[PDB]
Amino acid sequence: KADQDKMTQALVKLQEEDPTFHAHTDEETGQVIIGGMGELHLDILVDRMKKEFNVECNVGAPMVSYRETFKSSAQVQGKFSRQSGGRGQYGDVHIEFTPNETGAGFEFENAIVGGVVPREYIPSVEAGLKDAMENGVLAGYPLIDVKAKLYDGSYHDVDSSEMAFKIAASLALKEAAKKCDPVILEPMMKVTIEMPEEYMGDIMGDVTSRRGRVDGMEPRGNAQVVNAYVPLSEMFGYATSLRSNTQGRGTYTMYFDHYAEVPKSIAEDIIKKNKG
RNA sequence: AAAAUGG
RNA sequence: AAUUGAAGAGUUUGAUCAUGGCUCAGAUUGAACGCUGGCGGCAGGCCUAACACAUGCAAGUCGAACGGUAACAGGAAGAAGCUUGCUUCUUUGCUGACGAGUGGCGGACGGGUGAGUAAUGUCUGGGAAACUGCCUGAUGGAGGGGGAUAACUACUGGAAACGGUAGCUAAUACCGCAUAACGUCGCAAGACCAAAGAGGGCUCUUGCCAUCGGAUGUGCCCAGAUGGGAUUAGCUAGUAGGUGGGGUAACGGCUCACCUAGGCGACGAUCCCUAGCUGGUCUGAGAGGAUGACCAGCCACACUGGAACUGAGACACGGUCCAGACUCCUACGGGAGGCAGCAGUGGGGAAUAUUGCACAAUGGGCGCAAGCCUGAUGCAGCCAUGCCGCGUGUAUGAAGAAGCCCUUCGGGUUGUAAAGUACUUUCAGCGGGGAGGAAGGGAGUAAAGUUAAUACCUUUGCUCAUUGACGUUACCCGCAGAAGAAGCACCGGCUAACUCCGUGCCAGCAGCCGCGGUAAUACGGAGGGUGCAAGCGUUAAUCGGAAUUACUGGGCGUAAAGCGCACGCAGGCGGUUUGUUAAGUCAGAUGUGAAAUCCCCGGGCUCAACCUGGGAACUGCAUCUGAUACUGGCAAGCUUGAGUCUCGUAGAGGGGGGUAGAAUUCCAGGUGUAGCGGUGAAAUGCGUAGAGAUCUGGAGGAAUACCGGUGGCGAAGGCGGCCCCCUGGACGAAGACUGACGCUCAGGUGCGAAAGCGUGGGGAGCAAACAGGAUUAGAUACCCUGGUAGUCCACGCCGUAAACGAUGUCGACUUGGAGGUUGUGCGCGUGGCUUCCGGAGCUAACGCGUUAAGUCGACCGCCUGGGGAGUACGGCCGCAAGGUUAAAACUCAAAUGAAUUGACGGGGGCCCGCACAAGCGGUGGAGCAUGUGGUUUAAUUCGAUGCAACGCGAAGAACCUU
RNA sequence: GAGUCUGCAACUCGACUCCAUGAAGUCGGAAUCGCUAGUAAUCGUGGAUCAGAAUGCCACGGUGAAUACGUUCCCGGGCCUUGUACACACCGCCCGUCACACCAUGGGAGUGGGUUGCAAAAGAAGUAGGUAGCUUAACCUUCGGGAGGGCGCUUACCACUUUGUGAUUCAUGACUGGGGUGAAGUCGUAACAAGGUAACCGUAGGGGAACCUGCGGUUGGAUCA
RNA sequence: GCGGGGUGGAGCAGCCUGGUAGCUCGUCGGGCUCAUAACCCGAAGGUCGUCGGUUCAAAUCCGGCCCCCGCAACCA
RNA sequence: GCCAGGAUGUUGGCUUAGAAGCAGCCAUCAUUUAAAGAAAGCGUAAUAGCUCACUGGUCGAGUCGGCCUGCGCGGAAGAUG
RNA sequence: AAGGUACUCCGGGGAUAACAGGCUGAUACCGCCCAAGAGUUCAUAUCGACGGCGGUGUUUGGCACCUCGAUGUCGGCUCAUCACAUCCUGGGGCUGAAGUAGGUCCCAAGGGUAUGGCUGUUCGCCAUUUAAAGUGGUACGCGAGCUGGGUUUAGAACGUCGUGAGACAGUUCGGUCCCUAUCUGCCGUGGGCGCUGGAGAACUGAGGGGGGCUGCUCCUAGUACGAGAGGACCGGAGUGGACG
Ligand SMILES: [K+]
Ligand SMILES: [K+]
Ligand SMILES: [K+]
Ligand SMILES: [K+]
Ligand SMILES: [K+]
Ligand SMILES: [K+]
Ligand SMILES: [K+]
Ligand SMILES: [K+]
Ligand SMILES: [K+]
Ligand SMILES: [K+]
Ligand SMILES: [K+]
Ligand SMILES: [K+]
Ligand SMILES: [K+]
Ligand SMILES: [K+]
Ligand SMILES: [K+]
Ligand SMILES: [K+]
Ligand SMILES: [K+]
Ligand SMILES: [K+]
Ligand SMILES: [K+]
Ligand SMILES: [K+]
Ligand SMILES: [K+]
Ligand SMILES: [K+]
Ligand SMILES: [K+]
Ligand SMILES: [K+]
Ligand SMILES: [K+]
Ligand SMILES: [K+]
Ligand SMILES: [K+]
Ligand SMILES: [K+]
Ligand SMILES: [K+]
Ligand SMILES: [K+]
Ligand SMILES: [K+]
Ligand SMILES: [K+]
Ligand SMILES: [K+]
Ligand SMILES: [K+]
Ligand SMILES: [Mg+2]
Ligand SMILES: [Mg+2]
Ligand SMILES: [Mg+2]
Ligand SMILES: [Mg+2]
Ligand SMILES: [Mg+2]
Ligand SMILES: [Mg+2]
Ligand SMILES: [Mg+2]
Ligand SMILES: [Mg+2]
Ligand SMILES: [Mg+2]
Ligand SMILES: [Mg+2]
Ligand SMILES: [Mg+2]
Ligand SMILES: [Mg+2]
Ligand SMILES: [Mg+2]
Ligand SMILES: [Mg+2]
Ligand SMILES: [Mg+2]
Ligand SMILES: [Mg+2]
Ligand SMILES: [Mg+2]
Ligand SMILES: [Mg+2]
Ligand SMILES: [Mg+2]
Ligand SMILES: [Mg+2]
Ligand SMILES: [Mg+2]
Ligand SMILES: [Mg+2]
Ligand SMILES: [Mg+2]
Ligand SMILES: [Mg+2]
Ligand SMILES: [Mg+2]
Ligand SMILES: [Mg+2]
Ligand SMILES: [Mg+2]
Ligand SMILES: [Mg+2]
Ligand SMILES: [Mg+2]
Ligand SMILES: [Mg+2]
Ligand SMILES: [Mg+2]
Ligand SMILES: [Mg+2]
Ligand SMILES: [Mg+2]
Ligand SMILES: [Mg+2]
Ligand SMILES: [Mg+2]
Ligand SMILES: [Mg+2]
Ligand SMILES: [Mg+2]
Ligand SMILES: [Mg+2]
Ligand SMILES: [Mg+2]
Ligand SMILES: [Mg+2]
Ligand SMILES: [Mg+2]
Ligand SMILES: [Mg+2]
Ligand SMILES: [Mg+2]
Ligand SMILES: [Mg+2]
Ligand SMILES: [Mg+2]
Ligand SMILES: [Mg+2]
Ligand SMILES: [Mg+2]
Ligand SMILES: [Mg+2]
Ligand SMILES: [Mg+2]
Ligand SMILES: [Mg+2]
Ligand SMILES: [Mg+2]
Ligand SMILES: [Mg+2]
Ligand SMILES: [Mg+2]
Ligand SMILES: [Mg+2]
Ligand SMILES: [Mg+2]
Ligand SMILES: [Mg+2]
Ligand SMILES: [Mg+2]
Ligand SMILES: [Mg+2]
Ligand SMILES: [Mg+2]
Ligand SMILES: [Mg+2]
Ligand SMILES: [Mg+2]
Ligand SMILES: [Mg+2]
Ligand SMILES: [Mg+2]
Ligand SMILES: [Mg+2]
Ligand SMILES: [Mg+2]
Ligand SMILES: [Mg+2]
Ligand SMILES: [Mg+2]
Ligand SMILES: [Mg+2]
Ligand SMILES: [Mg+2]
Ligand SMILES: [Mg+2]
């Protein structure tokens, strides 16, 4: 970490030395990601750090930011009552959690009937859910693609507090996760690979090996272009492979697409990792 | 006799 | 004439007064940053890395010291193509000159930096033991010789740097000899010591040597002053002194030997941390506080550590030697170098300039002079960095235009603002004139002086050409045309300056108080305004406001602050009288206190900034001459303060020993019979193994009813039956005696409740701990039944309490009243002590009030917002418990005192109500009506919700109503 | 089951009648309400609303009690006084442990630096002293030498450097102590009223915590009719 | 290997000796209070680990199967 | 053994990014024939391509694979020789 | 009518345990058969479910045959010797083998095959090497060769159990290792006789023993191969480690 501060300075200098060098700390992962136009390029930079900058470093695969979503729908109740004398803290909310349309995120519905939960406490309930959803409901990753319907609740004239209702809301989400079976999501990436038709088969074979799907192929100029969607984690190291397959005559451009459920095996591994 | 508390 | 000088505000509360912190308005800067940007003058400009430095430059000069001649520019001579009379080519230091060398002088100045340094520094004032190139005064001398040596030559070693060997040579280079005295040595007699020539035409000029002066510079000494820390109190063996010897220009432990045992320090030594000092600068009414950039003086340092050499002067920025780290060269053997001179580069940093020009002037080195050298200096460049002056137009202009903003849509505001019209043109721009900084120096020419000389030289006049980096100088003049020239911050209060719109505890703002949750003068934008202006804001920084460290000029009953009390050393302070001294003090004088700056009066730049003449001031210090009241010293006194003695009085004053009565407990026995004991109510407990109760005898410990008291005694803490023994203090009466013998007191020392600790005793009662029983949601409590340490004694330790009057001690003074207690004189006096109340005065108020918290004086202790914290760490003390001394970071905008109006109280008093009591009839249970909640529903419309919603809005939903 | 009436229309969803049927209920847990006389209690009657639709509301008469000793207690209100740390005013204020996060700081086996004391070692260059040897322009000379000097060597002083052992200062250290700041956490309620056991001071013992208990002290406690 | 357990939500009875589910707390409804706690009144909730066997009948007895404890697990 | 042919509606359809005999899933055909699978393989992203089955020619006598049984073979690595 | 004895003692047993041997082979280890699958496709490059068949003697065991008128037992040291189920070096097939480097299987036993830290350790983990740090058998090779740390006498203590004496597949500190080699074997070294008359030399070679390891650099050649990164075979030369 003494060389970490030096690493910052080293990366700054390296960026000045080479425009193609791009240093960027991924906020979600909290890991600095070094971008290069080639493996050898990055290698030389790292070697330079070790010597010129005198910064000992070890390269690694960028961590992937995953998300969670309830795979099942279940109505749940969250009750929080803490009254032992004087001003207490009562709050009960019955919230129905249902898998939302992928990408629709959170679609909270206030279906409170009979004004069981007073209007003033309603926003707190929702806000409390949102905060709890941001926290991991399965492994620790932000819960997305879920719909919470507060159909029923309970309140006390004195004990009930907005914060109590936020607590009750969070409690509901917890028990919902136990019944709604959240699943980990992985960020899919749309990759556009262009190469001579001679290597087309090999490229598509690589994508399938990664786990990605070939969207389709299309003729451009002289080099065929294959559209595909590959997981970010799997996409790592594609550059070298592409050049190897195409004899350094292949180019690819990857962009984020959506979040797909991590393979049950992979999901299990992620949960294990997050657990410890 | 007992007789706490009240973001 | 040298003065003219002094503002507050916001924020603790429901409100108030006080206390107290925080914040703000001002001024200032080597500034930085952001935004903006016409011009000029003057000035300033690496605060950081005493970090590392590429390149050039910053110290040379002299041929009137000398051998020479490397050049070159000539001359003469001789050869030459032979301009047939010049040219060429050679020779000749031959001359003008001059490379290199010897020599002399300078290089110790000038320029840079502030690392080190808390005094071998600086500043002020004194002093004896010195030295001093160049300059200047006076008096003498200046004779006659010698031996070298560079350059040079040959040779030779090295990559280079740098050399080696042999030969030759000069001097104002070097050494004898003579000379030797207002010199040195010595008591004296005696003895001893120097020199250089050069230049012009015998003379003049310059230089040389000896001595004594002058000036100047420099060295040295002493006293006072010059940061912080005691959570640094001891320090020191050349150490302190002496003596002798040596050493220095000189005094000196400067050095050495020997001898003695000193020296320094609470008036701060030693050690630690920080730091160049000063004249000055900034702030301040001042006193202070802060600071030491530029300018001037002084000191210190020059890659780091160290040393000497030369010299008048250095332990030497651009010298030497050694070591070290760096950089560079190398043939690997060895070499070379030092920007804290100027400019400049890299690095560091928020941030600080051009590898300019000229020696025209001033000043310096060398020279006879001419001249040469000078990054000193004079100037130019960049930079709004500051200061100062000026400009960006000026009059007219209602059309009160458009257009913007706002509006009650009437209008208002921008705003005479703009258009429009009439003028002016600073400055910029273009053109053309034009100072002054310039003195001198160089030619002649003249007279005089000098001399043998109308020579040469010197002096003063005279005459003729001639010297400006800045520079396109200032300044003046002319020409075209308002043309080419305004921005920045702010408008909730403080604080001068308000609306609209957008946003909606979000975004945001903010020095403080706070502002923002849908009518934001507080955010953001717009319109309008306010303040400043080529600047305006922000940040950092200092002082002020802050009387908030209070010398001037504050506090301590309750706000922070009186040591628990006392004794007492050092220290501070001290009644009254005479004489004496003159230390302080006061007066006058004299020397000094650099210049600059500041101040006053002036002068000069068109003004101002800026520059300059004179004065004032420098508040201080030394010395001399005076004054003598007060303070001090000395001497003699006096009695009034203080003290002693004679006599008597009161007292729970202390220490020791003895004794009495009451009660509790226990033990033994008698009588007697079922309870006792305890509580709010109980229970545990005790009792038929005879309790409790009652009576008798005995044992032991502790404390002394009543008297008894706003009583008494004691420094305080404390002290209570009676008796004796030992002992301290206080007070009164009337005399005598002493003669200021006093007061306070850092440090120090002693005393010091209760609890606690050590050792050895004692132990009735009481009772931390502990146990059980209750109480309670729980009850580690309060209550009950038991019960150990301890409480008691001896000796030792601890050293603290709301150790309180939350009020230090001593002295004097300033209306009264009612009491207590204890003397004393003759009902009326007069002392000591004490309680309550109260006047003036004082106090924020409460209160204090002759026992002051009034009015003053002496000395001491202590305080400087609330927390953190009387804590940590260190020291000291302790057996331990702990005590004592005593921080910081961090955090908050308060904390606090007294009093006021409420409210409230399981505070008090006085009243009252179907409040309770005394009664009567009900509700809660059933069925049903009705309202409500909830749940259900396509919808079950909406509102009402503790008392004070729920047969409520609804005094009447089949449709309508709805 | 059979009707009546009002009304466009009585299924949802009217009142009423007739016949039949004949539920719970045998006096109401804890708790709780009204009423002091023409009152309660009970008995009928009328009215508004309104087509129709009262056990409600509003109003009218009939009959018609019991009990009040009193202020000990409960609750509320008024007035006077007193304490107060309360002021959207006791539904006030407010203390500490514990949980979590963050910040500064103390201790800590130690670890790495700076500075420095003491005791030694060391000895470049230079300067001074001595002189194994070597060498020598100027002076002297008996002409051989001599005087004197230089070099070398040696000694003293001393920089770099080295070693041991302390002191001090700074940084860092598993873990740990207390402090502060958070946020509607948990546990109680210690203080402020006599705060419900007056509080507080010193000391000692005990206890999850605020604290409790003993001993002595202070008033900076209320109360007193 | 030898023993003891597995019963309303929690901790405990009942088993021995078949018929014949208790106690305290918690929970729920009503009350008290401004409200909460405390307090008062009323009520619900184990078919007895998991099956099999026996018996007219099984928490009870027998035997597995799982669970959770205790003890033993040695000497060359 | 060898020389040939080895197909046509038709890439059967669906699905498949693509899937044409040869990913998978449904089919499962018909046609010209001597005969030629809605394909037994290799192959391709899919294609294509290379076979094969099937069949015709050539060749001129046996040929092919099960059953029962005799005897052998592999499976079969160790420490003094 | 219960216990302790490690303070112990006597008579007996290999009728009966602990050690080593034996028998056995459950277990262990090694190999094979079938092939569901995995491997983009594709059982068999590599791997392999559900099941099946063997081999070794190799762990943990079973049995109690040898030894109780005694067969010393963990680990280390010294010294070895064999097997091959091969760790390195040699040869080869396949590969999901571009090269380099691997994977897997076959052949091969000539030689070679760490030092330290910690622990009694074997082992293991760790540090740093190496071409490699092989796996087993040999009374878990080797105490009439050494050690004596472990373990199992008598002393003592802790935890624990027990009323206690004492005890523990707990721990802790301390605590006597004898033997002059007759025979076999082995390393050396002589005497006798023989080999056909005696004697002095020089030999032939049946037979036996020893030895046999390997790194790195350079060249080939930055050549083949690879888009690059990298980087050879084959062949040649030099210089080391260990050992003799
Ligand atoms: K104030
Ligand atoms: K300095
Ligand atoms: K000295
Ligand atoms: K002396
Ligand atoms: K000053
Ligand atoms: K120095
Ligand atoms: K000189
Ligand atoms: K000049
Ligand atoms: K004062
Ligand atoms: K004194
Ligand atoms: K006097
Ligand atoms: K006792
Ligand atoms: K005092
Ligand atoms: K503070
Ligand atoms: K009822
Ligand atoms: K109806
Ligand atoms: K009606
Ligand atoms: K009151
Ligand atoms: K800490
Ligand atoms: K430390
Ligand atoms: K209390
Ligand atoms: K106490
Ligand atoms: K026995
Ligand atoms: K096999
Ligand atoms: K395959
Ligand atoms: K045996
Ligand atoms: K192979
Ligand atoms: K081998
Ligand atoms: K072996
Ligand atoms: K054995
Ligand atoms: K052994
Ligand atoms: K043996
Ligand atoms: K032996
Ligand atoms: K034998
Ligand atoms: Mg010259
Ligand atoms: Mg001379
Ligand atoms: Mg002489
Ligand atoms: Mg300094
Ligand atoms: Mg002032
Ligand atoms: Mg000298
Ligand atoms: Mg110099
Ligand atoms: Mg220099
Ligand atoms: Mg410079
Ligand atoms: Mg920088
Ligand atoms: Mg020059
Ligand atoms: Mg205003
Ligand atoms: Mg608004
Ligand atoms: Mg300021
Ligand atoms: Mg002040
Ligand atoms: Mg004050
Ligand atoms: Mg106070
Ligand atoms: Mg106070
Ligand atoms: Mg006092
Ligand atoms: Mg005193
Ligand atoms: Mg005087
Ligand atoms: Mg002056
Ligand atoms: Mg006097
Ligand atoms: Mg007496
Ligand atoms: Mg008294
Ligand atoms: Mg005591
Ligand atoms: Mg005692
Ligand atoms: Mg008692
Ligand atoms: Mg008691
Ligand atoms: Mg005190
Ligand atoms: Mg007292
Ligand atoms: Mg006090
Ligand atoms: Mg009074
Ligand atoms: Mg303390
Ligand atoms: Mg202390
Ligand atoms: Mg009812
Ligand atoms: Mg009503
Ligand atoms: Mg309707
Ligand atoms: Mg009244
Ligand atoms: Mg620390
Ligand atoms: Mg030396
Ligand atoms: Mg309390
Ligand atoms: Mg109390
Ligand atoms: Mg109190
Ligand atoms: Mg207690
Ligand atoms: Mg066979
Ligand atoms: Mg064999
Ligand atoms: Mg034993
Ligand atoms: Mg025996
Ligand atoms: Mg046997
Ligand atoms: Mg036998
Ligand atoms: Mg055996
Ligand atoms: Mg045997
Ligand atoms: Mg298997
Ligand atoms: Mg066996
Ligand atoms: Mg047998
Ligand atoms: Mg035998
Ligand atoms: Mg093999
Ligand atoms: Mg072998
Ligand atoms: Mg072999
Ligand atoms: Mg061989
Ligand atoms: Mg090892
Ligand atoms: Mg063995
Ligand atoms: Mg072995
Ligand atoms: Mg032996
Ligand atoms: Mg043996
Ligand atoms: Mg042993
Ligand atoms: Mg052989
Ligand atoms: Mg061999
Ligand atoms: Mg060898």
From Swiss-Prot:
Annotated compartments: Cytoplasm
Cleavable signal peptide: none
Superkingdom classification of source: Bacteria
Family note: Belongs to the TRAFAC class translation factor GTPase superfamily. Classic translation factor GTPase family. EF-G/EF-2 subfamily.
Record function comment: Catalyzes the GTP-dependent ribosomal translocation step during translation elongation. During this step, the ribosome changes from the pre-translocational (PRE) to the post-translocational (POST) state as the newly formed A-site-bound peptidyl-tRNA and P-site-bound deacylated tRNA move to the P and E sites, respectively. Catalyzes the coordinated movement of the two tRNA molecules, the mRNA and conformational changes in the ribosome.
Protein name in UniProt: Elongation factor G
Residues represented out of the complete protein: 417 to 692 of 693
